[model samples]
Target: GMTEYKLVVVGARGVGKSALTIQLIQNHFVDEYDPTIEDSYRKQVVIDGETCLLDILDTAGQEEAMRDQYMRTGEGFLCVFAINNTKSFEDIHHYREQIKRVKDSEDVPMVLVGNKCDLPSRTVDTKQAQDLARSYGIPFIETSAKTRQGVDDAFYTLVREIRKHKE
Candidate 1:
């Protein structure tokens, strides 16, 4: 038997959303990348031995546009932020609100990912990201799309959470 799941990757622009998606799906890093102008969707694999279809809605990083489209979709989300960018961290609240407004339930499993964790000097304090995830009641993971660190775990964590809700 097979099951279908939609996982939207939402975050500020240039926060490595596309890179993370590429790393997770293709298991490779995209070096010369351009900003995603419109929503780009792709399905990827998860560790559960199931083919998880990720309709990765790479929405324009604008506030108004993202809020509107995000609310209309029935899917879980991976709220991503760059570890070195403070603004990205602050913008996570917007992602949270968008999920609450659009999704039927708040408990729709999400994994908070802090990308670019490979850079030690340029890092957003892990405690802050953890606190935010705690406040929102979502699992948190820090990863580096360049190094492929924690990328797979982040997606797998979300898949496991989604499955838990099912069973």
Candidate 2:
């Protein structure tokens, strides 16, 4: 029997959610900001002494599926925001609160993602995001999908978090 995890990636449009997910699964990066309309990807990850089986659920474009409903199915969540977009970073509360309500638990396995770190200018600094994540009691990680940096760490962090909860 495999311990499968439904990992949900949530955030506003144009936040590189697709890029991060694609990079994690395919080991390749997407050069453009293509908004994905609900895609699924499965991967068998073997890392450290712990391994997690991943099933990604993209919430940016599943119109028919109520976001809350689909998000409820997720064991771990990656609430992504762009490091260069201050609005999305501030809007993290909205995503966090919704997932909290749907899951009926504040201690859900989640990570605060700051994507697009490869860019030269960042509107939201690491300490700022990390402070917010710390306030919310979660890990704050930055990723550059284009450079394939921290992309795996993002998913691995979420999967490890799920495993922590599972055990």
Candidate 3:
């Protein structure tokens, strides 16, 4: 039997946290303008031939209170930032530090996701995002929840890396 693990999706608001979760679960994307009243929870995802359920926590963007609650759980995290939004990208550092404080270990694997890559004009520079991941010593991925580009791959890649670390 495979052990079930908690996977938390977190990031600044409008970074596609909910969109990513919906795409991963329902295979569809929601409107960017839609508001996420509260966080989405109990989303299950199967990756790398393993049945892993993700307790997807779709937190409010830039909301300190909600961010704190999810961080304290000390679960595996997927830190997402919109590729077109510089502020969202910059906020990854804050989210990263907060997770570290709660987890108390640098080994808590985080997959740094640069989402909304489909918009060419609005996209953040790929190299910069990659560099940020390098600085944090974690894997980086660019995805588009709209076109489904690199969507499934991102989650699977993270799972593969985490499994390798466990060996």
For candidate 1, list the clashing residue pairs, or say none: 71-102
List the pairs of residues colliding in candidate 3: 13-61
Q: Which scores higher on TM-score, 2 or 3?
A: 2
lDDT, residue 55, candidate 1: 58
| TM-score of decoy 1 | 0.85
The top-ranked prediction according to lDDT is 2
* lDDT (Cα, tens digit) per residue for candidate 2, span 1-167: 16678899988788888988888888888786677768988998886664657889876832222376776789998999888989888878888887888888768999999999999888998889988988988888888889987888888888888878878
Question: In model 3, which regions exceed 4 Å deviation?
Answer: 41-46, 64-66, 161-167
- Backbone clash count for every predicted candidate, in the order shown: 1, 0, 1
Candidate 2 regions off by >4 Å? 61-66
lDDT of each: 0.77, 0.83, 0.75
Superposition error at 48 for model 3 (Å): 3.3
Q: Can you give the lDDT of residue 155 in candidate 2?
A: 86
TM-score of each: 0.85, 0.92, 0.84
